[PDB]
Design a protein around this ligand. Sequence first.
Ligand SMILES: [Mn+2]
Ligand SMILES: [Mn+2]
Ligand SMILES: [Mn+2]
Ligand SMILES: [Mn+2]
Lengths: 108, 105
Amino acid sequence: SNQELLQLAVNAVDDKKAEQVVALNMKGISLDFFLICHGNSEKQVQAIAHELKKVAQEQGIEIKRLEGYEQARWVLIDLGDVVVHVFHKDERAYYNLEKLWPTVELEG
Amino acid sequence: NQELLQLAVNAVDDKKAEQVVALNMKGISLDFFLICHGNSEKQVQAIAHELKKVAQEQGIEIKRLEGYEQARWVLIDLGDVVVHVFHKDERAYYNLEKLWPTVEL
Ligand SMILES: [Mn+2]
Ligand SMILES: [Mn+2]
Ligand SMILES: [Mn+2]
Ligand SMILES: [Mn+2]
C-alpha cells in the first residue's frame, strides 16, 4: 500500500508511547511496509497492539493476522500492505531483527 | 532450486544438525529458508562451518554470515537459500512460527 496505512499505524502505535518506531520498506523483499517498535512491559506491548486493533476497526481495515498478543513478547498485527511488529524491550528476536530483513524515512 | 537446497541439507546433515526443515519462500520472499539446530555452541558452529566449507568448494558466494562467534543463531546467506542454524536453547528458534510450505526431504 502506501503511507496512508503506514501513517495510520505509526500514529496508533504513537498514541500508546511505543518506543524506537522503525518502518521497513519491504518492497522488493516481501510479497510493502513492516513497522517495528517495542514496549517496556507486557502491559505496554498489549496496549500498543490494542490501539492498533482499535484504530484498524475504526478505519475499517481488515486485520489479517494477530499473534502473540497474550504473551506480549512479540505481537504481530497483519494489516495487509503493512505489518506491525510490537516487541517487548526484552525480546531477543527484537535485537536479531537485523539478520531478518532498508528503512523508510517516516518524516518524509 | 533443490540443487543448492540439497547442497545445504547435506552440509548441515554431515554435522548432525537436528530437526532440519526447509521452507518454500515462493510467493513470500524475494526461495528456500532452511532451519535446523545444534545441541551446543560447538555443534552449532560445526554446522555453520561445514556449510561455509561446502559453499567454498562448490564456489557459491556467501552473502552473509552472522552470529557465528556467539553460536546461538548463525545466519548463512547463500543467496537463493538462507540457512538458519540455531542452538537448541535459542528462544527465537521457538518463535520462528510468528516469522512467516514445508519442503520435503
Ligand atoms: Mn501492495
Ligand atoms: Mn467504513
Ligand atoms: Mn510474560
Ligand atoms: Mn555463549
